[PDB]
Amino acid sequence: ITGTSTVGVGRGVLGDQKNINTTYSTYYYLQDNTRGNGIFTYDAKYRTTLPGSLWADADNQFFASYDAPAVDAHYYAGVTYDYYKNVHNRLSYDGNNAAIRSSVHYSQGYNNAFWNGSQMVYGDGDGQTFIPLSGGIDVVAHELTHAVTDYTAGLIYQNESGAINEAISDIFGTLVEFYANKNPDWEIGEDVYTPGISGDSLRSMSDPAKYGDPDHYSKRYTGTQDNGGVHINSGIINKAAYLISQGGTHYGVSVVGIGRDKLGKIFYRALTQYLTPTSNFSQLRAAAVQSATDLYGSTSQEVASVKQAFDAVGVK
Ligand SMILES: O[C@@H]1[C@@H](O)[C@H](O)OC[C@H]1O
Numbered sequence: 001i002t003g004t005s006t007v008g009v010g011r012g013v014l015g016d017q018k019n020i021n022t023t024y025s026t027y028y029y030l031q032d033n034t035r036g037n038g039i040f041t042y043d044a045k046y047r048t049t050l051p052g053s054l055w056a057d058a059d060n061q062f063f064a065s066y067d068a069p070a071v072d073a074h075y076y077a078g079v080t081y082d083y084y085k086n087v088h089n090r091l092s093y094d095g096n097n098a099a100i101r102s103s104v105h106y107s108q109g110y111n112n113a114f115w116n117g118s119q120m121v122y123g124d125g126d127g128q129t130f131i132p133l134s135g136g137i138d139v140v141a142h143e144l145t146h147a148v149t150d151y152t153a154g155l156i157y158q159n160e161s162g163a164i165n166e167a168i169s170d171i172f173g174t175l176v177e178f179y180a181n182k183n184p185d186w187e188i189g190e191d192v193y194t195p196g197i198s199g200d201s202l203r204s205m206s207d208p209a210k211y212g213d214p215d216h217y218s219k220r221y222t223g224t225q226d227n228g229g230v231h232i233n234s235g236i237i238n239k240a241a242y243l244i245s246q247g248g249t250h251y252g253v254s255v256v257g258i259g260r261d262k263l264g265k266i267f268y269r270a271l272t273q274y275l276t277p278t279s280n281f282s283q284l285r286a287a288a289v290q291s292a293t294d295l296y297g298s299t300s301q302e303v304a305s306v307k308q309a310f311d312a313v314g315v316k
Pocket residue numbers: 064066067
């Protein structure tokens with residue numbers, strides 16, 4: 001909508017207070033004009049029609065329980081935008097400042113979030129398994145990274161290319177969380193997962209097996225569930241990226257860590273320069289090696305660590 005840019009204030013899913021960029025035109029809309037061609041947040045009103053209504057507020061103060069998921073979807077979309085701009089010189093997910101749209105209050109008790117080819121979509125959770133999922137910045141960045149992947153490598157969402165697609169979203173969801181530096185970790189979804197269970201998460205990058213996911217190619221799931229286990233076998237790639245960044249010895253294979261920022265540059269380059277829609281784990285390895293070579297040289301520690309990490313998880 002057309003209006004004058006202004007700044008509102010509200011509270012997130014987790015009760016934290018934050019300023020949000022809004023637009024004034026009779027009402028104050030969740031429309032952030034400071035980032036590319038806008039970040040737009042919508043209210044699905046407990047239904048499944050998308051995008052719904054552009055969020056409209058009467059006084060620019062968003063402290064109601066009902067507003068919190070919209071506050072966080074709006075705010076964390078901006079953080080993810082900032083990450084890709086400042087770290088990877090990328091303007092929005094299509095690299096040309098496409099408008100980022102997010103709908104919250106999707107359905108009733110919906111325990112998920114997703115990028116639907118055009119926008120992000122967040123359920124409220126049933127209050128038991130999930131609270132509103134936009135409250136997890138790694139969830140938001142996870143979904144928005146899917147838009148980045150769809151516009152670049154285009155990894156088919158099935159089998160190994162689908163698991164790479166999932167791993168990429170877990171990776172950059174985690175790196176965006178570290179970028180904001182609020183209780184960051186190598187776990188996925190901890191902030192919105194099981195409010196009644198402390199210390200758990202949806203997946204673990206540091207130790208995929210913690211939740212039954214493979215941490216080695218030999219343990220990969222080859223059935224048909226989950227489009228061939230795209231959310232399961234991602235553990236194999238998640239573990240390799242954890243090892244690249246943090247180091248460790250895994251099934252007796254030692255990996256020297258190189259840090260988070262270099263992991264991001266290697267995988268972003270791999271994602272945008274070398275991966276294709278049908279790429280498999282082995283081709284991901286080659287992409288990661290060629291990216292680290294481009295960035296740091298064939299005889300670098302970085303290239304060596306990329307090689308050690310994929311050996312650890314059994315990807316040749
Ligand atoms: O109480 C809710 C209110 O916060 C919102 O603005 O409109 C829908 C209501 O359910």
